Amino acid sequence: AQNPNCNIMIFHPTKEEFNDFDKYIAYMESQGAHRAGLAKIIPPKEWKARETYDNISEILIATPLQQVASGRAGVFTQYHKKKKAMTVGEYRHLANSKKYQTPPHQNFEDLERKYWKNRIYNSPIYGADISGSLFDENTKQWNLGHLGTIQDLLEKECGVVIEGVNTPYLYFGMWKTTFAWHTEDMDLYSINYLHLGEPKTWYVVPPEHGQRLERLARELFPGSSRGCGAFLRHKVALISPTVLKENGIPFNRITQEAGEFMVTFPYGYHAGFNHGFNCAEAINFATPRWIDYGKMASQCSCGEARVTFSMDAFVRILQPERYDLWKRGQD
Ligand SMILES: O=C(O)CNC(=O)C(=O)O
Ligand SMILES: [Mg+2]
Ligand code: NI
Numbered sequence: 001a002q003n004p005n006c007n008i009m010i011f012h013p014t015k016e017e018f019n020d021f022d023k024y025i026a027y028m029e030s031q032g033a034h035r036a037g038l039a040k041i042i043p044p045k046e047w048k049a050r051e052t053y054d055n056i057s058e059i060l061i062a063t064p065l066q067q068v069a070s071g072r073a074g075v076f077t078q079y080h081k082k083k084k085a086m087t088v089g090e091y092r093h094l095a096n097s098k099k100y101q102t103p104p105h106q107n108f109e110d111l112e113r114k115y116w117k118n119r120i121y122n123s124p125i126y127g128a129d130i131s132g133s134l135f136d137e138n139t140k141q142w143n144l145g146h147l148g149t150i151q152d153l154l155e156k157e158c159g160v161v162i163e164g165v166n167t168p169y170l171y172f173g174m175w176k177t178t179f180a181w182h183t184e185d186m187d188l189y190s191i192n193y194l195h196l197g198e199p200k201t202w203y204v205v206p207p208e209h210g211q212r213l214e215r216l217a218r219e220l221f222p223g224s225s226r227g228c229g230a231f232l233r234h235k236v237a238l239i240s241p242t243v244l245k246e247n248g249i250p251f252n253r254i255t256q257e258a259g260e261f262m263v264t265f266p267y268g269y270h271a272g273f274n275h276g277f278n279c280a281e282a283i284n285f286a287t288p289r290w291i292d293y294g295k296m297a298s299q300c301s302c303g304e305a306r307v308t309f310s311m312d313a314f315v316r317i318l319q320p321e322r323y324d325l326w327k328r329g330q331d
């Protein structure tokens with residue numbers, strides 16, 4: 001069995017190997033990459049996502065989210081308070097202000113220590129989940145707006161034709177902005193490209209051990225667990241590496257830098273934080289190997305997780321018993 005310790009693998013495709021996205025994903029899995037839950041892909045040196053970022057300040061962040069924490073430094077939840085709209089130029093200036101900017105630090109490790117010590121005492125503002133793309137239309141390789149759609153994958157594998165669309169999302173981050181522990185909707189893959197700015201640190205639990213993280217989360221967030229049988233779908237809970245290590249939960253960590261892709265694999269729980277002002281683009285995708293994960297994915301029916309239009313069909317076709325109850329949650 002390849003990668004039996006479930007280490008995060010790093011790939012360096014050549015420009016030739018960068019042509020066929022599906023084939024490269026399947027290659028990485030042949031090497032055991034999925035066992036980690038997360039892989040890094042460094043593009044060939046010849047590739048570029050677009051020519052310059054010199055003209056992005058006019059993108060609007062219609063609903064910036066202030067991420068307010070509750071709990072203790074290593075075990076906390078965050079709620080998202082909606083803020084007034086601002087442009088990316090306005091948000092970048094805010095990120096760089098004395099109140100929000102990255103503190104002085106020695107290296108990524110020192111910064112990680114400072115994040116876990118101090119995150120809860122601040123409320124950074126995240127421009128998350130903005131429909132759009134920063135890939136040039138002329139970028140033909142690994143262009144996250146030109147991927148094969150999940151609807152088409154389901155049609156190709158299973159013969160069924162369904163409504164829905166699959167588009168990318170932009171994320172504008174600042175120091176301490178946080179993504180809580182989650183898997184993707186319907187335990188899909190994700191791919192994330194860091195277009196510019198400061199790094200993003202990721203934590204990940206191997207898919208084969210995801211249920212160990214779930215059991216810990218039920219113990220650490222006991223009221224949330226009674227409220228919902230899949231409350232990590234709410235995307236609000238944080239657990240630090242120190243707490244994971246104290247509880248024996250297998251995990252890995254890695255830092256993504258500008259110019260690099262990350263892939264998350266079906267049922268790979270992940271969480272993380274941004275080092276400073278940055279912009280990422282991400283989208284969900286599927287392969288044939290996902291279908292069985294999609295059939296088994298948990299679902300939030302308490303009503304909190306409230307998701308996209310396109311998830312309806314995935315539930316309807318892959319999980320027809322749950323359909324009914326899950327849709328009561330969404331309506
Ligand atoms: O970048 C972020 O804030 C969160 N991204 C993801 O969870 C992802 O790409 O799957
Ligand atoms: Mg602009
Ligand atoms: Ni994710």
Ligand SMILES: [Zn+2]
Nearest residue numbers: 228300302304
């Ligand atoms: Zn729920």
